[PDB]
Design a protein around this ligand. Structure first.
Ligand SMILES: C/C=C/[C@@H]1O[C@H]([C@@H](N)/C=C/C=C(\C)C[C@@H](C)/C=C(C)\C=C\[C@H](O)C[C@H](N)CC(=O)OC)C[C@@H](O)[C@@H]1C
Ligand SMILES: Nc1nc2c(ncn2[C@@H]2O[C@H](COP(=O)(O)OP(=O)(O)OP(=O)(O)O)[C@@H](O)[C@H]2O)c(=O)[nH]1
Ligand SMILES: N[C@@H](CCC(=O)O)C(=O)O
Ligand SMILES: [Cl-]
Ligand SMILES: [Cl-]
Ligand SMILES: [Mg+2]
Lengths: 129, 208, 995
């Protein structure tokens, strides 16, 4: 009897954490939210390269997409014990690679310290590759 | 596919804030009244391919009204916005609806009660019935908390595409390029990073 | 070159306007934006209307012609009465001529609906100005022109629809009372002829687009026309048969029949009752034969969203619920109408199954009406037994979380009523839904959650015995479910739901001490589970059970060695060891609820001492070490511990109120010392690091300490019974600790919570601390005013708290304003008017209330110098500031309180309750009454503010206002009439005689 008729599949999830991402707008000299949702460290199973991939709640639109470059440095923000600011030279969330000053804030200092730990582990992996 | 969407409703109800959140992810705290209209493309990725809304974000203040119903011509869909913390904004919903449907006779329309994040709600659930006889979809939304913030567009997408199973899908995520640090911009970045580190992140008492 | 249209010195280039318009509507980014600004400037040019004739004749772009009509509409609605009669007839004839021309060209009529509809609205704006006094033939000519052409007849239905809307539906805010009544009487006088045209079109038939337009106009007529047009003509038969069979007319017809169901109809007349029954029968008959049978799966149809199905099913829900809420008693007695009654309800049951939140709420409002009626009305429930049995399943399967307050409330009330009507049927449905969770067939987190919410919702409806058997059954079944399930995700969902159900059955817990004790000990075990959500639901369930069963924790239960509150307190360290701070606060709050049940003071105070043991010991060590070495307060961890100690005190004070006093007394003096120590560190840090310091985690932590101290004092004082102790013990140290600190900090370091704390202090004991209230004003008044008087946005919290404090000071200790130096009292009046100009409702309402209260406070003083000086200095300031916010269109939400204040001010003069002349000497004959001078001042002020008003309009308005200053609704009517007239030229001054 005849019966009735993302581009993340190549990647291992190294780390996942809820976060709010900001970009600095020097013109207004003010932080602007870029998105809230799961920040993921994705290791490409072909190149062994680790990127940050962050998608907004509800819409799942990309708010960060960049290599965790070995040359990046996580710096505290004056206002927060649970945030990192870093320069990103090439983020492709909005298509064309752009430089940004990012800030990413977590639910807790613990989450932010863990993020820094993982971000450094990712920098080493990217260094070897 | 592209669809003209007109956003109408009283001044300060959150029309521009809502659209900006959707365009850039930012939450604008400042009230800068729209002058006439601001038009922005807004794309969503769906299981049926991309949908583009031509968003005509109109002025709700009478003195900044510009072309008023002139903005509504060839709209294919609409959001009527009010503020659940401001009763007058709900009282004016029939006036916005009237002006809109006189120009756009047969379009899917969502009524949005914005600012449900605010504890002291003045337009209570039981009061909000205007949508029923007008066949409007209704959502409680917060541009601030993102409560139901995708629902108006998802509902309109389903209505315009004529597919009630249409979902928003994760927009594909291209491999990002490897970075070459420019030695000439070294001192440039130190500056910019300095300023950013010493500007406080907003809303340090929020969950994120 | 697009800016060429903005040059009115030359003639208007139509091809250029069409370019600008095309660029706006079809263009993109930069080009669209430039065209936008040019079009907006063109449209707002006050001479632009002169160009409309030229645009309408010579443009090829329907968008240009649309914008041309927008320009004409501005002229017609605002400045029309300035035009010579000849020009008004010219314009009227051009508009009518253009409409007929577009309707007579079939291609244009088909393809230019936007332009025709906008043309029709422009015509209606002209009828609002000229009809019927200047256009008596309009309706006979429209009716005559209707027979010339189907397109013209259809378009005339659109015109009549818009006219009905503008006169009856939207007149209330847009016209004077007098003009609205005039147009309503005018339409009412000619409706007989209009109805004859509509009825003849509906009978003679043929064109669906014509029939639909006629039915759209009828829907509007139904808002106001007498029932006899519907009941004493064939139209009910036509709507409920012919127009329901074709889908083109079905949507509008159903909306018409919904409104027919709302007509004011004689109540005592058997012919009308039969007709009301007949149209319903006819309608349902057409639906069952032409659309779908009673059995049809409307959930499936709606989901599929084919054509206009969703709107049709929404409209059917609106029709059935409207008709049945009014008429179901007509169908209930006659056994020959039983099938119709139950089929109509069965359609509603099917509609209730649609997955559409807002449609569900529509049907639920109706079900609430029905089951409330069956609970009370004799000999009725038996009719609906099968409808009610289905509805039980529908409500249970749709139960939402109690967080959805209104929807949960509606659903619970319907399910309570239904449970009362048949407790066995409800129980059976819930037990068998539970069996489908246990057998896996219907298992999901959503499904076990919704079922638990439904089971919880009917607590209190069964007899205590039936409930006992039901709860035991449900808890055994949920426990079995929990065992069955693999992995703590699943087990945690079921444990949550067990916790939820138990918390909703306190009558059961109160009867079964052993079970209650076990539940509490199990919640204590769950307070060690790190699995997400488990600790929160354990703490949430704990406080909920305690709120309901607190008495069972404070007595010695038979076969216990002590009250269980002692057992909780003894083990509190171990119980709360794994909780987050917010959970700990909830726990201590719950313990406070129990301890407040103990009415023996010695025992209550001992329990409170015991409960507060760990925060008090942590506090004592910190205060000793902290005072020994003020350095230790720079430690981030210590600041967090202190904040958490103060928040634990707040939590326990929140549930104990007046009973908290001995605990407040243990920490009070050292808490105010800490407030000063923390204040110095903040001031120090801001000086050393800058205003940025206030964003730092350390300073925010220090400020949290100050805010929680203020919240603790505010919480206690708001609930204090012994006010002598508040004044004698608490107030002086509080004011010494907070007031100078608030004054002497830079604006960015001042806590708005200080103002909020002082509001409570003045509210509760202001009458007893006249010197304290003066100190409060001296400390906060000028420096807060200076923070909030540069714009409407800066320091939003301070703004709100500032007017709350002034309001309560003005209510309780008005003497403090009497003691202000003249210059400061001037700032007080300036502060109130500033609040009036705020758009923020919180500040605006308080400002108008302060003004009203201040007028009352001055009035109370009687004929003394201060009151006479007040009126000479401020009476006209308050009258003119109030008129400003009434008339500037930016403060509409304040309308009612503006009107109340203006009526108070005018009644003072029209009663002669002001003892001195308000006018300074040699400004008016020295005899003159304040009444004459007020009339004169207002006439002058309104003439200057609204130069386009005639003297007669202003005089008639003010004559009405002063006559009506003892009748707020009418006074307000006169104010709204004035707000309409200031938006136009040539408003009728007789409008202000409206009665
Ligand atoms: C008055 C008479 C009452 C009777 O008392 C009977 C008595 N034997 C039981 C009593 C039992 C009690 C009081 C505790 C129960 C009601 C509550 C729960 C929340 C049990 C939950 C699950 O086990 C949790 C799960 N194991 C935990 C996990 O891994 O993840 C979170 C149960 C029954 O026979 C009757 C209700
Ligand atoms: N609490 C809260 N505030 C909101 C929300 N959405 C917007 N706001 C704020 O309220 C104001 C709304 O400003 P706009 O978005 O410009 O308002 P608008 O309706 O576009 O105003 P017009 O352009 O004058 O018609 C801003 O201060 C926003 O930050 C919301 O969901 N919650
Ligand atoms: N003046 C009308 C009543 C007006 C109203 O009720 O608003 C008669 O008498
Ligand atoms: Cl609806
Ligand atoms: Cl009890
Ligand atoms: Mg705006």
């Amino acid at each position: 009897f005849e019966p009735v008729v993302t581009m993340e599949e190549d990647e291992e999830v190294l780390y996942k954490v809820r976060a709010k991402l900001f970009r600095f707008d020097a013109d207004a000299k003010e932080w602007k939210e870029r998105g809230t949702g799961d920040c993921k460290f994705l290791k490409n199973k072909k190149t062994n390269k680790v990127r940050i991939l962050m998608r907004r709640d509800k819409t799942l639109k990309i708010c960060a997409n960049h290599i965790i470059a070995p040359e990046y440095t996580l710096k505290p923000n004056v206002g927060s014990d649970r945030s990192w600011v870093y320069a990103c030279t090439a983020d492709i969330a909005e298509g064309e690679a752009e430089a940004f000053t990012f800030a990413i804030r977590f639910g807790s200092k613990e989450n932010a310290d863990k993020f820094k730990e993982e971000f450094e582990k990712a920098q080493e992996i990217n260094k070897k590759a | 596919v592209q669809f003209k969407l007109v956003l109408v409703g009283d001044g300060g109800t959150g029309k521009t804030t809502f659209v900006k959140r959707h365009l850039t992810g930012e939450f604008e705290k400042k009230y800068v009244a729209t002058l006439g209209v601001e038009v922005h493309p807004l794309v969503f990725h769906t299981n049926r391919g991309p949908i583009k809304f031509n968003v005509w974000d109109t002025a709700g203040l009478e003195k900044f009204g510009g072309l008023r119903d002139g903005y509504y011509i060839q709209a294919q869909c609409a959001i009527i916005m009010f503020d659940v913390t401001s009763r007058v904004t709900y009282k004016n919903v029939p006036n916005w609806h009237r002006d809109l449907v006189r120009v756009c006779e047969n379009i899917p329309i969502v009524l949005c009660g914005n600012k449900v994040d605010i504890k002291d709600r003045k337009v209570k659930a039981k009061s909000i019935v205007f949508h029923r006889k007008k066949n409007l979809q209704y959502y409680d939304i917060s541009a601030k908390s993102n409560y139901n913030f995708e629902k108006p567009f998802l509902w309109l997408a389903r209505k315009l595409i004529g597919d009630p199973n249409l979902e928003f899908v994760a927009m594909p995520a291209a491999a990002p390029p490897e970075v070459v640090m420019d030695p000439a911009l070294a001192a440039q970045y130190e500056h910019d990073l300095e300023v950013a580190q010493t500007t406080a992140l907003p809303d340090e008492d929020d969950d994120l | 070159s697009m800016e060429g249209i903005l040059d009115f010195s030359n003639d208007l280039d139509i091809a250029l306007l069409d370019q600008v318009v095309s660029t706006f509507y079809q263009g993109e980014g930069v080009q669209q934006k430039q065209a936008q600004e040019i079009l907006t400037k063109f449209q707002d040019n006050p001479d632009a209307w002169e160009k409309v004739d030229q645009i309408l004749q010579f443009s090829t772009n329907p968008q240009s012609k649309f914008i041309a009509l927008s320009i004409l509409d501005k002229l017609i609605t605002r400045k029309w009465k300035l035009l010579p009669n000849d020009h008004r007839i010219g314009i009227r004839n051009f508009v009518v001529g253009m409409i007929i021309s577009m309707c007579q060209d079939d291609e244009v009529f088909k393809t230019q609906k936007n332009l025709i509809n906008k043309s029709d609205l422009t015509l209606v704006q002209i009828l609002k100005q000229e009809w019927p006094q200047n256009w008596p033939e309009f309706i006979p000519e429209l009716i005559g022109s209707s027979s010339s052409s189907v397109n013209v007849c259809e378009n005339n239905m659109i015109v009549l629809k818009l006219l009905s809307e503008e006169v009856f539906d939207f007149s209330a805010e847009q016209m004077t009372q007098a003009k609205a009544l005039h147009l309503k009487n005018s339409m009412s006088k000619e409706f007989e002829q209009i109805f004859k045209l509509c009825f003849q079109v509906l009978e003679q038939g043929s064109s669906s687009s014509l029939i639909v337009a006629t039915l759209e106009s009828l829907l509007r007529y139904l808002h106001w026309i007498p029932y006899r047009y519907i009941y004493e003509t064939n139209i009910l038969e036509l709507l409920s048969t012919k127009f329901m069979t074709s889908p083109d007319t079905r949507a509008i017809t159903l909306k018409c029949l919904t409104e027919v169901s709302n007509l004011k109809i004689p109540q005592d007349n058997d012919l009308i009752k039969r007709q009301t029954v007949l149209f319903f029968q006819n309608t349902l008959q057409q639906i069952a034969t032409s659309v779908m049978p009673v059995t049809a799966d409307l959930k499936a149809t709606y989901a599929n969203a084919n054509g206009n199905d969703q709107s049709f099913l929404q409209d059917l829900a609106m029709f059935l619920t409207t008709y049945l809420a009014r008429n179901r008693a007509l169908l209930e007695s006659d056994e020959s109408l039983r099938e119709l009654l139950l089929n109509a309800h069965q359609y509603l049951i099917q509609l209730s199954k649609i997955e559409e939140r807002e449609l569900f709420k529509t049907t639920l409002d109706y079900w609430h009406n029905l089951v409330a009626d069956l609970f009370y009305e004799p000999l009725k429930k038996h009719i609906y037994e099968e409808i009610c049995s289905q509805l039980r399943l529908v409500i249970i399967e749709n139960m939402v979380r109690p967080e959805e307050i209104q929807l949960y409330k509606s659903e619970r009330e319907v399910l309570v009523y239904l449970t009362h009507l048949n407790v066995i049927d409800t129980e059976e449905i819930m037990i068998s839904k539970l069996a489908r969770q246990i057998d896996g067939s219907e298992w999901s987190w959503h499904n076990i959650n919704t079922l638990s919410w439904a089971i919880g919702s009917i607590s209190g409806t069964m007899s205590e015995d039936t409930e006992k058997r039901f709860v035991v059954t449900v808890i055994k079944d949920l426990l079995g479910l929990c065992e069955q399930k693999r992995g703590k995700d699943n087990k945690a969902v079921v444990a949550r739901d067990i916790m939820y159900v138990v918390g909703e059955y306190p009558r059961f817990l109160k009867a079964h001490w052993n079970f209650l004790r076990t539940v509490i000990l199990k919640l204590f075990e769950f307070m060690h589970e790190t699995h997400e959500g488990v600790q929160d639901m354990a703490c949430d369930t704990f406080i909920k059970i305690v709120q309901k069963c607190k008495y069972h924790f404070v007595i010695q239960q038979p076969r216990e060695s002590e009250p269980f509150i002692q057992t909780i307190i003894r083990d509190i360290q171990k119980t709360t060891a794994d909780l987050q701070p917010q959970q700990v606060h909830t726990f201590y709050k719950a313990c406070g609820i129990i301890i407040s049940e103990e009415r023996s003071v010695a025992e209550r105070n001992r329990l409170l001492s015991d409960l507060m043991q760990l925060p008090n010991m942590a506090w004592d060590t910190i205060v000793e070490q902290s005072t020994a070495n003020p350095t230790l307060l720079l430690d981030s961890e210590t600041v967090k511990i202190i904040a958490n100690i103060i928040k634990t005190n707040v939590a326990v004070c929140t549930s104990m109120g007046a009973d908290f006093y001995p605990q407040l007394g243990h920490i009070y003096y050292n808490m105010l010392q800490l407030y000063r120590a923390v204040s110095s560190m903040i001031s120090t840090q801001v000086a050393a690091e800058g205003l940025i310091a206030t964003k730092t985690p350390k300073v925010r932590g220090l400020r949290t300490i100050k805010k929680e101290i203020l919240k603790l004092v505010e919480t206690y004082i708001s609930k204090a019974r012994n006010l002598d102790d508040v004044v004698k013990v608490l107030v002086e140290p509080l004011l010494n600790a907070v007031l100078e600190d608030y004054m002497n900090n830079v604006p960015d370091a001042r806590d708005a919570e200080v103002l909020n704390c002082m509001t409570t202090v003045v509210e509760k004991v202001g009458h007893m601390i006249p010197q304290g209230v003066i100190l409060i004003l001296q400390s906060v008044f000028e420096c807060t005013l200076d923070m909030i008087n540069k714009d409407f946005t800066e320091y939003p919290e301070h703004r709100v708290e500032f007017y709350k404090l002034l309001k309560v000071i003005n209510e309780k200790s008005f003497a403090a304003f009497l003691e202000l130096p003249p210059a400061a009292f001037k700032l007080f009046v300036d502060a109130i008017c500033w609040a009036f100009k705020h758009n923020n409702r919180d500040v605006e309402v308080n400002g108008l209330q302060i003004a009203l209260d201040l007028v009352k406070n001055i009035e109370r003083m009687g004929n003394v110098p201060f009151a006479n000086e007040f009126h000479k200095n401020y009476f006209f300031i308050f009258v003119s500031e109030t008129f400003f916010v009434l008339t500037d269109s930016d403060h509409k939400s304040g309308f009612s309180k503006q009107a109340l204040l203006l009526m108070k001010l005018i009644s003072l003069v029209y009663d002669n309750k002001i003892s001195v002349p308000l006018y300074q000497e040699a400004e008016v004959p020295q005899g003159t009454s304040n009444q004459v001078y007020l009339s004169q001042y207002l006439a002058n002020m309104l003439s200057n503010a609204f130069p386009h008003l005639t003297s007669e309009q202003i005089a008639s308005f003010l004559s009405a206002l002063t006559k009506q200053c003892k009748d707020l609704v009418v006074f307000k009517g006169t104010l709204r009439d004035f707000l309409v007239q200031i938006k136009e030229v040539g408003g009728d001054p007789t409008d202000y005689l409206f009665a």
